[PDB]
């Protein structure tokens, strides 16, 4: 029955980044896995090692505080089958599927298996004219943590470069029917 | 009697740093005030244009965030007056400001305010990547990358205020001026 073509929820599928995820483009983002994904029950290899994963990322955030949704949308097997996950600035209504169809914002979480992340910040004077023209008579203590307080609206630029490890980890038991014409679309038993 | 030699609480002194304010070394300032300064009431000046005013300095990092006390603890006019305000480095920043609020309840009696500082500010993927796999493996990519950026603010810059900053040296209370003797006012604070 169902276990036998069924991933378990919490099952850790290794996979490395093909292309990288950068934080101001909201982009596409190809992974590929590392190892042959088994049914909870039998023998059935579900996700071959070497099958492709394709994702959609986006970064919000609410000025420094970093946030990144990649919903990872197909899977593709090396020898081509079709395995839907979720359908098709072109981000945000993948998400709506998912939260109408499920309630879940997101399918199948990304996690830590050693990310390659490149970190820079996108940025007697600036700071002067502001002292006396706005803040004249404020405190020392006062102007300059306005200064650095103020240095950190600014977001900075993240990458996860490709190469980047990573654990792709299903939110709920996903069952796998049996491909027709290269094509599974995947059912989520939440 | 008294407000003819009183300066007046949040009277303005403006004046400019002779010395530099480095965020690392805590240390000593001084200051030049830019013009004579007169008792509340009557045409005394007490703090005569061109006196040079010394301090000490702390900065004190609760890191991420900037700390900078200034005890203004001496005055000396043009004509070689001394005028205390706090007697007896980051320990002694420390104590004065102790012994300040021992006897007035107050941490400064003197703020210092700007009037345009001149303020430098320099700062502090084959690295980051160890500790995911130390102590982080299982974890949320939105909760690594954050950790990582919060811990960034968690060193704090080196900030400088470079001499010829110009700054308001501000009294917390009414301070009174006793007649100098033998070059010598030990200052009031009417606190």
Redesign the interface.
Known sequence: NKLLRTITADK?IPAFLITPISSQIAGKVIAQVESDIFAHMGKAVLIPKGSKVIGYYSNNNKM?????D?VWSRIITPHGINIMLTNAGLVGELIERNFQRYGVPLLL???????????TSAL?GD??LM??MR???????Q???Q??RDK?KIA?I?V??EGSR??ISPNTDIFFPIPRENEVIAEFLK
């Open positions: 850790m420094g505080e970093y946030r990144l990649i979480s990304t996690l830590t298996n050693g990310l390659l992340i490149g970190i007697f700071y002067l002292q006396l803040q004249s008579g404020m405190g020392i203590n102007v300059v943590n200064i650095l950190s900075p993240v996860i470069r990573v654990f």
